[PDB]
Design a protein around this nucleic acid. Structure first.
Ligand SMILES: Nc1nc2c(ncn2[C@@H]2O[C@H](COP(=O)(O)CP(=O)(O)OP(=O)(O)O)[C@@H](O)[C@H]2O)c(=O)[nH]1
Ligand SMILES: [Mg+2]
Ligand SMILES: [Zn+2]
Ligand SMILES: [Zn+2]
Ligand SMILES: [Zn+2]
Lengths: 427, 512, 417
RNA sequence: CACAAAUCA
RNA sequence: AAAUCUUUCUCCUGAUUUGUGAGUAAAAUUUGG
């Protein structure tokens, strides 16, 4: 009758409170760790048990052999997007008798950042502790044009959309929003899905493209036979040829080919290389200039505030600046949510307009929209003089300096070139 | 030796200081400092900035995160037996449960809804009233926090009443939301390294950098400033009640209650304190008592000083400095071009805490260091080898190992000195996986956890292995818990399976 | 799914059964009624019609699938639903007017808001305070650190012998001689002997701090690791002589003397007088059977002993050496002496940092890092960051702080930045 | 979500 | 007697990363070279 004592005076309590009450009550003793491990030969017996019973039951993890050339660079943040169990997968695991707490803990799509200062030619992602040695997460690709698909600039184009301007293969699919429906085509099966009050209603959620669309839209897959579309141009669009914008795969593992249309590869699960970087942020913005919301770049803070600042900077500026800002807004706005990414239709916010400086952080990159409007990150570099005395260990200022600290002899001063076109717009 | 480092070094190698002194002295010094500040003789506690531009969140529904109101951390539970106040230290879970039992409430949300919707302060909410809750929620209990490097005198920490925590959670969450909506560069959640990178990018346009810290941060943030910010973000009754409790807070030292009207004691309102500055100007990339503002001319520096003073963010003259070739925030120092400053920096040593815990912690530290440009990989390999040799010297006695297996570490009777690169790239005997930073728990951790749990009554019926979809806010009675357990046991029996098999995401994904 | 309707749903599923006994309506807000492993698409589930039912109000749509039938509750005392049976059940079960509580906003202004605001107004408020005048000047120069060290020396001075620091070097006695010397020293000091172990007995305390002075640096610390390991061992093994490869110690518990019923076994918070041996030549010399050695004591509470023991000496030395500049020779008092200095004294300093449980050296290191990084600092205020002598008390922490300042001064002297 | 380890304020 | 209210019979708030989740009985010498 402990329920009548711990929760005296109440007959019903929340699951949180009950679970928190039934937690092991660990205690802290003044004994050191070594003395505790020595006590009663507890660690000795534990080691004996591990070597006699537990050790044989340890799966043999695979060795890592993939390596790439790496160079020391600025202190960047490696953005890992490790996924969690999907809703249906969680249900299936729970009904199979798996631990509820562990499954629920695994049911969370989390974004993590790791400070690493090391960059490779393709700007890949390295393991924990092996960034110095260039141990990439990606495994060796079997077919060449798969690696071409995952690569921004394929070495050998097979003439098809995966790694060049062309049509689709049998191994590629695409999900495109037509009217009020999401059409998924793979090459054999054409399905239509709808967004039904936090759910993704589709004929068969098990479809790989359907699962990918559910993950992209942040919706729970669901079965709904009463879903159909009137016009299905999926055949013609599949048979047509499209231009391939040079960009790394979005964190979701797909590339945009048309307005609200994303191509996916069956074998490639998720992007292994940092989608957004200093040298590719503006190219990424230009590529999605008029492709609707993409939701591929996480912006620190509030997305509404970022869009307000983008719109305020969008009020003035040259057409190219407006296009760049529209592309950035498309990049940061999620897909399918109540967001007005289109800056033309966005209502101007005076409160976000009066601010003297408009800063937005895209994937840890602080971009000043005011500077972007006046042609800084693309046209001309920003120079600030740090001192008039030469410093030790700093290279001379090149003729077209990139971002960084340099020494200038014509002026005899230490300069800090910022927002240099040679870094962002590296034509 | 930390003095002769060519690069930056915080001297973090050795463990933090330890002190068995009673917390009375430090708490008394903190209270005296707060009272002295209240007199307006040394520091400023009066806010002057314009927070009229903060967005109003008063229309948002009152949502309480229950998970944050229950934990094993200590808290002050107050009892009024015979007109005397008795403050006891109990787990926050026990304090919250006792509060909910005193005033009949299924959940904290119901309690706050009832409190907000009373027609009088004396109206009963069970065996208590809002006036009694306010009176009790202002009491705090002092304690000493040590093992903080660079603080020979251990700091003073304070345990708060469950009601105070319940009311402060709402305001803190909404203040963080307002910070996200208003801050020029959001940092309330970014880590130290992310803040350093953002600062390195932000201050690229100005010649000088002001690496500053705030002194007496908790004592300089009056209840008036907190209520000002809360009213700016529209808290109404919650903000008023919290400010009333803060202004009337009492701290129990030894056996006497001491009034501490000034300041906020603990960092319970770090988000609100940060908003007190971020709401008045956008020139500071700061969170709590850490800002990285930059300037070009002395006039801009004077403007920065005025802004800091007006927002009760008193500059720390002892620690604040000006740099032109670097910038440091949250102990992370970066060059003006973004490169991490050469040197050990925040790298810390691993005290001997177990034959395999020490090796695992050394591996984790070395991986963190090599990932950045702290040291080349071969240096990390050499350091790991030296640490393995030291562990062999320390833990290779019969009281720690009776084995002679070759694959075992030299510190457990074996002859294997694993290479750091071999360990990191899963190129070791499965016995060494636990030693990996991302491997499973070592034998030492399991033994220590068992010893800790094996020290002590009567346990409630278990409620583990729940549906991953059932929200944790649903109400369960004793009969409901029994029925849930019976149903789960019957389902397992029908499947012919014992207690639920543990789930590991890594293995499942590997076999997928 | 809103908890507001939970109670309401409970009224709906009022002992309704189907299939001769099975409950018909399963509430989504009830854990026992909930069907495991099924997503929730409504306030309750009807098995007979296999349909999800959700409840709404006028002009308050709820996020649910279109397939979920909505029992819209009109402003008037009427319930309208697409399904006739559900509407009839709504009319029947909801006989007593169930007014759903309105959602409470964060900005809710309670009836006592004005009263609490008045009470707060009548309470004390702070005063403005002064605006500091900040003068930005160059960081402290070598002269300032020299002044700090000179002030420390003048105020406290130096000890005649290194005291326990001398225990970092071999005492020149074999294991048997060391054990005999330690046991006879304990016996001479009238230490109580019980169960084959030594216990130190005390009756009254002066309640005043012990004398503070700076410990001169021994030549080297070959036994730093051994001494720290012995200290770690002595956390629980107290009252008996603990031996090592090249040295030995004796941790005598210090326990109160009641006189008849006195503490016999040490408890969690019993302090230890750690006794160690070093080469003779100081006032602490002890002789027995022709064996002479300097016996040095150190009083440690359990936390200090654990902290000192857990430290690793070799690894810290190597990590520091990874990016260290050429350490200069220093004299017995941490002063640059090229002619007759010893570099090994630096090891001793490190050992001191390990023995100093207050770790004031960490504070000095942080301040020196700021100094090296800084270009301009507040006048007369940044310099007042090395004055940590008021933060610590004891011979060991005082010596550690003094030698941290000496290291800073030496860095500014030989390797200017 | 809870516990444990490291770091930061 | 010393690192002197101790030798007397618990450590707050928030954040980043990582790993685990029905595994159940006193006390500091027993037992670390
Ligand atoms: N409740 C806690 N707040 C902390 C803690 N550490 C830091 N802080 C917060 O950060 C603030 C600054 O504390 P620091 O760690 O910088 C201590 P410092 O000696 O530099 O403070 P001053 O006395 O103002 O010089 C402190 O007032 C709190 O608001 C902690 O352990 N607990
Ligand atoms: Mg700082
Ligand atoms: Zn191809
Ligand atoms: Zn179609
Ligand atoms: Zn002596």
């Amino acid at each position: 009758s402990q329920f009548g004592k711990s929760f005296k005076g109440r007959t019903e309590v929340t699951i949180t409170e009950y679970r928190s009450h039934t937690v092991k009550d660990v205690h802290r003793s003044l004994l050191t760790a070594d003395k505790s491990l020595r006590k009663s030969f507890c660690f000795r017996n534990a080691l004996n048990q591990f070597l006699d019973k537990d050790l044989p039951l340890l799966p043999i993890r695979p060795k890592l052999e993939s390596r790439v050339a790496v160079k020391k660079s600025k202190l960047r943040s490696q953005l890992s997007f490790r996924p969690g169990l999907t809703q249906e997968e969680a249900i299936d695991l729970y009904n199979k008798g798996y631990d509820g707490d562990s499954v629920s803990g695994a049911l969370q799509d989390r974004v993590v950042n790791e400070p690493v200062a090391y960059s490779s030619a393709d700007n890949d992602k390295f393991h924990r502790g092996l960034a110095a040695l260039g141990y990439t997460l990606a495994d060796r690709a079997f077919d060449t044009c798969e690696s071409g698909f995952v690569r921004a600039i394929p070495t050998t184009p097979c003439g098809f959309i995966c790694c060049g301007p062309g049509s689709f293969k049998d191994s590629l699919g695409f999900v495109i929003k037509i009217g009020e429906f999401w059409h998924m085509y793979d090459g054999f099966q054409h399905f239509v899905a709808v967004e039904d009050a936090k759910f993704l209603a589709s004929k068969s959620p098990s479809f790989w493209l359907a699962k990918r669309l559910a993950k992209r839209l942040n919706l729970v897959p669901k079965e709904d036979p009463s879903v159909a579309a009137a016009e299905c141009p999926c055949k013609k669009v599949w048979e047509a040829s499209f231009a391939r914008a040079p960009t790394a795969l979005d964190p979701f593992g797909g590339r945009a080919f048309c307005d609200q249309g994303w191509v996916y590869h069956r074998d490639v699960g998720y992007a292994t290389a940092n989608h957004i970087s200093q040298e590719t942020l503006f190219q990424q913005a230009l590529s999605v200039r008029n492709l609707g919301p993409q939701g591929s770049a996480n912006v620190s803070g509030s997305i509404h505030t970022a869009l307000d600042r983008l719109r305020a900077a969008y009020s003035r500026g040259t057409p190219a600046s407006r296009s760049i800002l529209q592309g950035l807004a498309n990049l940061i706005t999620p897909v399918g949510e109540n967001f007005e990414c289109d800056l033309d239709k966005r209502k101007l916010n005076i409160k976000a307009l009066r601010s003297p400086e408009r800063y937005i952080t895209i994937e840890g990159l602080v971009v000043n929209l005011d500077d972007v409007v006046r042609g800084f990150y693309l046209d001309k570099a920003k120079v600030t003089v740090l001192s008039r005395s030469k410093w030790m260990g700093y290279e001379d200022l090149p003729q077209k300096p990139p971002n960084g600290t340099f020494y200038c002899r014509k002026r005899k001063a230490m300069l800090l070139i910022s927002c240099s076109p040679g870094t962002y717009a590296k034509k | 030796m930390w003095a002769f480092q060519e690069g930056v070094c915080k001297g973090n190698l050795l463990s933090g200081p330890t002190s068995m002194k009673a917390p009375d002295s430090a708490a008394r010094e903190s209270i005296d400092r707060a009272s002295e500040i209240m007199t307006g003789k040394s520091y400023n506690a009066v806010h002057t900035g314009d927070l009229s531009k903060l967005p109003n969140q008063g229309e948002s529904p009152l949502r309480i995160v229950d998970s944050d109101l229950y934990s094993e951390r200590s808290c002050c539970w107050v009892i009024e037996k015979e007109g005397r106040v008795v403050c006891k230290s109990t787990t926050l879970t026990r304090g919250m449960t006792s509060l909910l039992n005193t005033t009949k409430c299924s959940s904290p949300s119901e309690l706050i809804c009832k409190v907000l919707t009373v027609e009088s302060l004396s109206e009963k909410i069970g065996d208590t009233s809002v006036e009694e809750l306010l009176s009790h929620g202002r009491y705090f209990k002092c304690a000493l926090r040590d093992q903080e490097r660079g603080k020979p005198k251990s700091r003073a920490i304070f345990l708060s009443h469950p009601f105070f925590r319940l009311l402060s959670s709402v305001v803190e969450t909404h203040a963080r939301s307002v910070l996200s909506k208003v801050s020029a560069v959001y940092t309330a959640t970014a880590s130290a390294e992310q803040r350093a990178m953002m600062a390195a990018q932000v201050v690229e346009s100005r010649k000088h950098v002001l690496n500053g810290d705030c002194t007496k941060y908790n004592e300089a943030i009056d209840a008036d400033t907190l209520l000002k910010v809360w009213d700016a973000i529209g808290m109404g009754s919650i903000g008023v009640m919290l400010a009333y409790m803060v202004r009337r807070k009492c701290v129990l030292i030894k056996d006497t209650l001491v009034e501490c009207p000034g300041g906020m004691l603990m960092g319970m309102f770090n988000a609100t304190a940060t908003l007190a500055l971020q709401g008045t100007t956008d020139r500071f990339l700061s969170f709590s008592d850490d800002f990285i503002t930059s300037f070009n001319s002395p006039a801009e520096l004077r403007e920065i000083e005025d802004l800091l003073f007006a927002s009760c963010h008193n500059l720390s003259l002892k620690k604040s400095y000006i740099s032109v070739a670097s910038l440091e925030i949250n102990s992370c120092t970066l060059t003006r071009d973004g490169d991490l400053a050469t040197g050990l920096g925040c790298t810390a040593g691993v005290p001997f805490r177990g034959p395999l815990v020490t090796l695992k912690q050394t591996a984790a530290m070395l991986s963190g260091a090599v990932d950045s440009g702290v040291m080349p990989f071969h240096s990390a390999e050499r350091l790991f080898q030296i640490k393995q040799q030291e562990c062999a010297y320390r833990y290779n006695n019969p009281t720690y190992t009776t084995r002679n297996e070759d694959f075992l570490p030299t510190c457990l009777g074996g002859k294997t000195v694993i290479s750091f690169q071999s360990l990191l790239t899963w190129d070791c005997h499965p016995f060494w996986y636990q030693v990996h930073p991302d491997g499973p728990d070592t034998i030492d951790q399991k033994v220590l956890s068992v010893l800790a749990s094996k020290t002590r009554r009567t346990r409630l019926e278990a409620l583990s292995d729940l549906d991953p979809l059932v929200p944790h806010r649903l109400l369960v009675s004793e009969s409901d818990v029994s029925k849930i357990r019976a149903a789960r046991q019957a389902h397992l029996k029908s499947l012919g399976l014992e207690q639920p098999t543990n789930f590991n995401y890594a293995i499942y994904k590997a076999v997928q | 799914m809103d908890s507001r309707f939970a109670q309401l749903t409970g009224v709906f599923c009022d002992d309704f059964t189907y299939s001769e006994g099975s409950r018909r309506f399963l509430s989504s807000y009830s854990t026992v009624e909930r069907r495991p492993g099924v997503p929730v698409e409504g306030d309750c589930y009807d098995c007979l019609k296999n349909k999800w039912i959700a409840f709404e109000l006028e002009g308050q749509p709820r996020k649910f699938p279109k397939a979920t039938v909505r029992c819209i509750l009109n402003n008037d005392a009427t319930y309208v639903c697409s399904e006739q049976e559900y509407q009839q059940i709504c009319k029947v079960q909801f006989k007593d007017y169930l007014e759903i509580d309105g959602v409470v906003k964060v900005g809710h202004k309670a009836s006592y808001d004005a009263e609490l605001r008045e009470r707060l107004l009548e309470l004390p408020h702070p005063k403005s305070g002064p605006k500091p005048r900040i003068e930005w000047v160059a960081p402290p120069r070598l002269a300032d650190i020299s002044k700090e060290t000179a002030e420390l020396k003048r105020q406290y001075g130096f000890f005649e012998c290194s005291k326990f620091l001398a225990c970092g070097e071999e005492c020149g006695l074999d294991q048997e001689a060391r054990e005999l010397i330690l046991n006879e020293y304990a016996r001479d000091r009238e230490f109580e002997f019980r169960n084959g172990g030594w216990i130190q007995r005390y009756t009254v305390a002066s309640h005043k701090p012990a004398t503070q002075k700076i410990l001169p640096l021994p030549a080297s610390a070959p036994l730093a690791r051994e001494l720290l390991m012995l200290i770690a061992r002595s956390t629980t093994q107290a009252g008996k002589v603990l031996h090592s490869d090249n040295t030995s110690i004796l941790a005598v518990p210090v326990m109160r003397d009641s006189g008849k019923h006195s503490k016999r076994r040490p408890t969690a918070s019993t302090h230890h007088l750690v006794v160690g041996l070093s080469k003779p030549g100081c006032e602490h010399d002890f002789e027995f059977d022709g064996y002479r050695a300097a016996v040095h004591v150190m009083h440690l509470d359990p936390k200090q002993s654990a902290n000192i023991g857990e430290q690793d000496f070799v690894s810290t030395r190597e990590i520091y050496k990874l990016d260290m500049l050429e350490l200069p020779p220093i004299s017995r008092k941490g002063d640059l002496d090229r002619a007759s200095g010893l570099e090994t004294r630096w090891d001793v300093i490190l050992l001191l940092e390990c023995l100093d449980s207050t770790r004031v050296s960490q504070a000095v290191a942080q301040h020196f890092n700021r100094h090296r990084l800084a270009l301009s600092v507040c006048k007369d205020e940044f310099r007042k960051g090395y004055q940590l002598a008021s933060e610590i008390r004891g011979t060991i922490p005082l010596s550690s702080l003094y030698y941290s300042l000496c290291a800073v001064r030496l860095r500014m002297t030989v390797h200017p930045f």
